[PDB]
A paper describes a structure:
To bypass this protective barrier, some phages encode polysaccharide-degrading enzymes referred to as depolymerases to provide access to cell surface receptors. Here, we characterized the structure and enzymatic activity of DpK2, showing it to be a capsule-degrading hydrolase specific for K2-type polysaccharides. Based largely on homology modeling, but supported by recent structural analyses, depolymerase RBPs are modular, comprising three functional domains: an N-terminal domain that tethers it to the phage baseplate or to other elements of the tail, a central β-helical domain that contains the enzymatic activity of the protein, and a C-terminal domain which may either act as an autochaperone or, in some cases, form a noncatalytic carbohydrate binding module. While the archetypal siphoviruses such as Lambda, T1, T5, and Chi use “L-shaped” or fibrous appendages on their tails to bind cell surface features, phage RAD2 has globular appendages comprised of the depolymerase RBP DpK2.
To investigate the mechanism by which the RBP capsule depolymerase functions, DpK2 was purified as an enzymatically active trimer and its structure solved at a resolution of 2.7 Å. Initial reconstructions using C1 symmetry revealed an elongated molecule of approximately 180 Å (18 nm) in length, consistent with the dimensions of the tail appendages measured in the initial TEM micrographs of the RAD2 virion. Three discernible domains of DpK2 could be observed: an N-terminal domain containing an extended triple helical bundle, a central beta-helical domain, and a distinct C-terminal domain. C3 symmetry was used to further refine the structure of DpK2 to 2.7 Å resolution. However, due to the applied C3 symmetry, high-resolution structural information of the N-terminal triple helical bundle was lost. The central domain (residues 317 to 642) is formed by three parallel right-handed β-helices consisting of 10 rungs, with each helix of the trimer being formed by an individual monomer. Analysis of the surface properties of DpK2 revealed a prominent negatively charged cavity (yellow oval) located within the central β-helical domain at the interface between neighboring monomers. Adjacent grooves (yellow lines) were observed emanating from the cavity, which may facilitate binding to or funneling of substrates toward the active site.
Residue numbers in the entry:
A (entry chain A), B (entry chain B): 455 to 906
């Protein structure tokens, strides 16, 4: 049941929440009776609460908590339709949870894990409101986890360019999770490459993600597998990696070889499957305060599997090869989409010169990509790996993309080379000795893909 | 200090700045005393001036100069926060500068070069206002250099689809320049492919630039250099170019070979490094009024350098091969992001059939890319070249992108060919003569990159 349409013009809600004084206060009536103002010691409030509405326009008002009242949010929108905000002043929130837990930068990590499905933790919490829009307000003094929280099937939201870095952890906190739900929202690019960015779920549902990032690694499985294989669910050639090897040569359907690594801050050896590339390369006549960093965030998308022991490692190195930062990622960590695949976020620290990424084994044995990362193809039969690089500035150092030229036929249409038909061995009865180099050259051609 | 939030509704500011009559006017007081109205002969004004505000909404008003008053702009926003415009009528501006210089179509080039940092030259001038929104209003009769001007760290702006071609030079004039600033704005795509487009700085900061354009040339330096190299800071091969050569076959790190050319309208020879491709290919049963042009603008991004005689040349040719238009681009011209790289804009004239682009030398000697275009790798240690083609219509002729097919393994995962191990020379003592054709094929395989 609902009412539509509700119109709000230049309306201000200020200071509306349980405060320190109100919780301990007792109202004395004219009949000399005392009434306890609080319902409980964990009483929490809000400035504006909306539920069961449609076509609500809040045009140029103000939502702020002055006097530090215990608020779970400034505006709570639940089960509404087409809630649009037009330049509302938002400021001075006192972050709390629904059960009365104070949101503080000290315990900001336990709030995201234990209170993900809670209706709290942002200046504006949107729950089950399809047509949401915020339209670039000015926000400041936000003492909670994020600025906007989206959850419970908010699938067509649009978020404008408000003040990026005001909350404690994020700017946009997408908490939508359900396999049946298809979320596709629009986020301003300036909110992604800021000091506080968006979480991995918000980047999963960001439709204009190529406006701020680009793919630095794109690998998928082939259609027809090679000769020594019993399937075509993983790569069989290793041609996309600089170090490492394959798990098996008699069954290529087993993926890459996962070698043991004790922790993510340990050095990678040539036996591990990993790549390496440099960033932020500027000359000697440039000051490091003028030349900023290249990459701000790195988003990795991979297949999802319930069990693990196979880790996707990523490291940020500097000059002299010292590890500045690292992180593990188990197969069950990619659950933006629980059934198929998910996203993870990695923060590139300032001063990093090189980036390493690959697959390792967290247990003390040698595993394979199929059995120890994909769980034997139980949740997905097509492996893929996508790594997005969110640049600090749009195109300062040049975005990384595959080479192409409209005037060169090798890149415009591709090269005109085909696999040669199989040539039999040289067994002429006219001379020996030369059959040494001929059959070896014919064998090298067949072994390197040039010949069938 | 500031006031927030200021609300404007259906408010009109009409014909306010100093006029011809007012400048020469003298007020006669009741006490028979005379007061000169004009402070100086170069008095200038605007309809609305805003400074030090936050969360300002101008909802459906009108800003117009009637009676031709001397105005630097219609609205001047300076050091504000979240200024949003909602469908405001804007019209009839008389372009002037802050010092009283009239902005006409004759001096439109000297004003852009000499008054870049001036707070003037547009219908709406935005200076140091992060959250600016324009919401696409209807605009006409604009006698300034541009319609919107952005400068002084306006880093997150959205510009809607207003009337494109009303100003004299541009639609959006981005004047943001600073090494520490990170600008990321959103511009409506219909404002980029218009008669008047956006300047090179606005395309630099345009995050949704792939919605209106596509890369027709993308080239970067490799990681590991070739054998005679002394470093890997430039392309060591010439596979991206159809003409020209390398500077020296003994170093390969000096880059391409820059040959002398008198002017940009001179014909390019096979000794020059340049490419060529055709545009607007329609059949005989199509009328040229129905078949429009293919490319509207071309944006080139390259590394910055403070000196050098090497020039990036681009030419627009026709049938019979006559040069319609051309332009030089020195290394200092790529300074839209001063310390690293920059953008330039080239206007493709109507009737053009072919486009040529490459690198030449403006001085009468043969130079190299490392020394005569870059300053010895003093600013950027990685060379890149990205050329964007802004199409007249979105996909009329088909956008140029690398070939791909999801059903072909050669394009889905790549070809399964590797460099063969080095095969020694055939020196068998059993027969000669054939060893000539054997070692010549083995030498060619090693020379063509097929063999190590």
């Amino acid at each position: 049941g609902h009412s539509a349409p509700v119109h709000f013009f230049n309306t201000i809600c200020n200071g509306n929440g349980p405060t320190s004084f109100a919780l301990g206060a007792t109202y004395k009536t004219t009949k000399n009776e005392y009434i306890k103002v609080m319902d409980s010691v964990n009483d929490v409030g809000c400035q504006a609460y909306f539920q069961g509405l449609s076509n609500v326009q809040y045009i140029g008002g103000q939502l702020s908590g002055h006097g530090s009242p215990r608020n779970t949010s400034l505006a709570t929108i639940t089960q509404c339709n087409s809630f649009i905000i037009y330049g509302t002043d938002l400021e001075d929130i006192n972050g709390f949870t629904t059960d009365g837990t104070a949101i503080t930068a000290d315990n900001i990590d336990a709030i995201e894990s234990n209170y993900l499905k809670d209706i709290s933790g942002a200046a504006i919490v949107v729950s089950s409101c399809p047509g949401f829009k915020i339209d670039s307000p000015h926000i400041f003094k936000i003492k909670t986890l994020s600025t906007i929280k989206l959850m419970n099937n908010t699938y067509n939201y649009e978020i404008g360019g408000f003040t990026p870095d005001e909350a404690l952890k994020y700017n946009v906190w997408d908490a939508n999770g359900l396999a049946t739900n298809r979320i596709s929202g629009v986020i301003h690019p300036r909110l992604v490459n800021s000091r506080l960015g968006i979480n991995s779920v918000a980047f999963d549902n960001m439709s204009n993600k190529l406006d701020v990032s680009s793919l630095i690694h794109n690998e998928t499985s082939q259609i027809v597998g090679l000769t020594p294989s019993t399937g075509s669910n993983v790569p069989h050639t290793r041609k996309m990696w600089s170090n490492g090897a394959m798990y098996s040569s008699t069954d290529l359907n087993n993926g890459f070889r996962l070698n043991y690594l004790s922790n993510h801050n340990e050095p990678l050896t040539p036996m591990h499957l990993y790549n390496e590339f440099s960033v932020s390369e500027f000359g000697g006549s440039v000051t490091e305060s003028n030349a900023l960093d290249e990459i701000k965030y790195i988003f990795i998308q991979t297949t999802y599997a319930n069990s693990g022991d196979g880790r996707f490692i990523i490291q940020a190195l500097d000059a002299s090869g010292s590890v500045l930062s690292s992180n593990w990622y188990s197969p069950q960590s990619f659950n933006s989409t629980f059934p198929i695949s998910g996203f993870v976020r990695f923060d590139v620290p300032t001063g990093a010169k090189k980036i390493r990424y690959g697959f390792v084994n967290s247990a003390n044995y040698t595993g394979s990509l199929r059995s120890h990362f994909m769980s034997g193809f139980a949740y997905n039969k097509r492996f893929f790996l996508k790594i997005y690089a969110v640049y600090n500035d749009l195109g300062r150092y040049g975005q990384f993309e595959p080479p192409y030229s409209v005037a060169i036929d090798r890149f415009r249409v591709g090269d005109n080379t085909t696999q040669m038909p199989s040539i039999p061995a040289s067994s002429a009865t006219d001379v020996a000795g030369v059959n040494e180099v001929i059959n070896s050259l014919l064998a090298s051609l067949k072994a390197n893909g040039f010949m069938s």
